[PDB]
Design an enzyme around this catalytic site. Structure first.
Site, PDB file in Angstrom:
ATOM      1  N   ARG A 200       0.858  -1.173   0.000  1.00  0.00           N
ATOM      2  CA  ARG A 200       0.000   0.000   0.000  1.00  0.00           C
ATOM      3  C   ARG A 200       0.894   1.222   0.000  1.00  0.00           C
ATOM      4  NH1 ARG A 200      -2.880   2.759   4.889  1.00  0.00           N
ATOM      5  NH2 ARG A 200      -4.755   3.513   3.794  1.00  0.00           N
TER       6      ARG A 200
ATOM      7  N   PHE B  80       1.582  10.793   1.139  1.00  0.00           N
ATOM      8  CA  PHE B  80       1.197  10.311   2.437  1.00  0.00           C
ATOM      9  C   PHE B  80       2.207   9.328   3.071  1.00  0.00           C
ATOM     10  CE2 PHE B  80      -2.032   7.615   4.888  1.00  0.00           C
ATOM     11  CZ  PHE B  80      -1.994   8.390   6.037  1.00  0.00           C
TER      12      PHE B  80
ATOM     13  N   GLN C 126       3.469   1.730   3.015  1.00  0.00           N
ATOM     14  CA  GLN C 126       3.236   0.707   4.056  1.00  0.00           C
ATOM     15  C   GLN C 126       3.657  -0.644   3.535  1.00  0.00           C
ATOM     16  OE1 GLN C 126      -0.789   0.907   5.596  1.00  0.00           O
ATOM     17  NE2 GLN C 126      -0.799  -1.247   6.283  1.00  0.00           N
TER      18      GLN C 126
ATOM     19  N   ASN D  79      -0.554  -0.894  12.471  1.00  0.00           N
ATOM     20  CA  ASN D  79      -1.713  -1.240  13.284  1.00  0.00           C
ATOM     21  C   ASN D  79      -3.147  -1.306  12.744  1.00  0.00           C
ATOM     22  OD1 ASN D  79      -3.568   0.841  14.502  1.00  0.00           O
ATOM     23  ND2 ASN D  79      -1.566   1.609  15.310  1.00  0.00           N
TER      24      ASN D  79
ATOM     25  N   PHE E 286       4.832   1.828   8.342  1.00  0.00           N
ATOM     26  CA  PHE E 286       4.759   2.729   7.216  1.00  0.00           C
ATOM     27  C   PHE E 286       5.880   3.757   7.401  1.00  0.00           C
ATOM     28  CE2 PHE E 286       2.611   6.345   9.228  1.00  0.00           C
ATOM     29  CZ  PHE E 286       2.031   5.742  10.317  1.00  0.00           C
TER      30      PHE E 286
ATOM     31  N   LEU F 105      -1.744  11.610  12.770  1.00  0.00           N
ATOM     32  CA  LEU F 105      -1.496  10.219  13.206  1.00  0.00           C
ATOM     33  C   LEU F 105      -0.990  10.133  14.633  1.00  0.00           C
ATOM     34  CD1 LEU F 105      -0.144   8.672   9.826  1.00  0.00           C
ATOM     35  CD2 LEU F 105      -2.455   8.912  10.892  1.00  0.00           C
TER      36      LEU F 105
ATOM     37  N   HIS G  97      -0.583   5.950  16.011  1.00  0.00           N
ATOM     38  CA  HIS G  97       0.416   5.011  15.451  1.00  0.00           C
ATOM     39  C   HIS G  97       1.694   5.293  16.236  1.00  0.00           C
ATOM     40  CE1 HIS G  97      -2.202   3.797  12.258  1.00  0.00           C
ATOM     41  NE2 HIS G  97      -2.650   5.038  12.254  1.00  0.00           N
TER      42      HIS G  97
END
EC number: 5.2.1.8
Lengths: 135, 164
Positions: free
Chosen positions: B55, B60, B63, B102, B113, B122, B126
């Site tokens: 991903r 951004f 991951q 997570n 990530f 975040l 995270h």
């Protein structure tokens, strides 16, 4: 966006006042709750006074359904991308851990997730459980 | 040193891309650092060698770390169980930050990530546990294979990894 009205609520009130748990409450709940967000569904339920045991059977249903939902929709790992939303959880569909906006986003996404239609199904199963006990 | 350094050698559809190295903050989050470090070496008998960045969302993050299912639904820690969010002392302050992916609170496994922007929102959700030391240029290249919903256009693998 507008919250269900006092006016629609009156009606739902008058219905439950006499049709508390005859089969006719169910078709009425479904009409009065057209296009409802979870919040509005809960607003409807809240105006019911008394009938504590019945409400509790309904709550038990909601709680069972919500857990099943969660089961059938494991959350993906990783941080939620910008301009994206977490997948709703049971409690989100039931309006206990979600917001209006959030509820609103889901029912609109393409394709949407109609959390209002989902919760409303759960409520209806709950009302069938009431009706079966009492009538 | 207290803080270990780990490397990933990134390949794209088998073609070498470049190396990225990471400082892991064992001095702030030793349990989380120790998980990633040990998954990076393969010393537990399993870990990130071979695994893929499943991903990638340009602007951004990238991951990866799901070395059991390769798609986000797997991953496993060295602890024999998913582990708690150790702390949230460190913040997502920019590109390079390395953080746990997570699936809800206190569900850390192996997924992580690498931020490619500031992602302050975040913070508190995270666990931040390292940062890229060398090769952010390579994470920037990796980003070019991502898409709005994360699907990658080529297979982006950790062709090799370990501790320096």
């Amino acid at each position: 966006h507008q919250a269900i009205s006092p006016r629609t609520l009156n009606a739902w009130v008058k219905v439950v006042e006499e049709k508390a748990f005859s089969p006719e409450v169910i078709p009425m709940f479904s009409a009065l709750s057209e296009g409802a967000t979870p919040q509005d569904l809960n607003t409807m339920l809240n105006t019911v006074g008394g009938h504590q045991a019945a409400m509790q059977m309904l709550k038990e249903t909601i709680n069972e359904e919500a857990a099943e939902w969660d089961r059938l929709h494991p959350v993906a790992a990783g941080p939620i991308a910008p301009g994206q939303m977490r997948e709703p959880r049971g409690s989100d569909i039931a309006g206990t851990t979600s917001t209006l906006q959030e509820q609103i986003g889901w029912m609109t996404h393409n394709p949407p997730i109609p959390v209002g239609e989902i919760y409303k199904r759960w409520i209806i199963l709950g009302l069938n459980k009431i009706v079966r006990m009492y009538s | 040193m207290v803080n270990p350094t780990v490397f990933f050698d990134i390949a794209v559809d088998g073609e070498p891309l470049g190396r990225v190295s990471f400082e892991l903050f064992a001095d702030k989050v030793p349990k989380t650092a120790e998980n990633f470090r040990a998954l990076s070496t393969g010393e537990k008998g399993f870990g990130y060698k071979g695994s893929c960045f499943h991903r990638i969302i340009p602007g951004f993050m990238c991951q990866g770390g799901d070395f059991t299912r390769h798609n986000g639904t797997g991953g496993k820690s060295i602890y024999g169980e998913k582990f708690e969010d150790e702390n949230f002392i460190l913040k997502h302050t920019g590109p390079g930050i390395l953080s746990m992916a997570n699936a809800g609170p206190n569900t850390n496994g192996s997924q992580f990530f690498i931020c490619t922007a500031k992602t302050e929102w975040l913070d508190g959700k995270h666990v931040v546990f390292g940062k890229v030391k060398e090769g952010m240029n390579i994470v920037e290249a990796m980003e070019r294979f991502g898409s709005r919903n994360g699907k990658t256009s080529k297979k982006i693998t950790i062709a090799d990894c370990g501790q320096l």
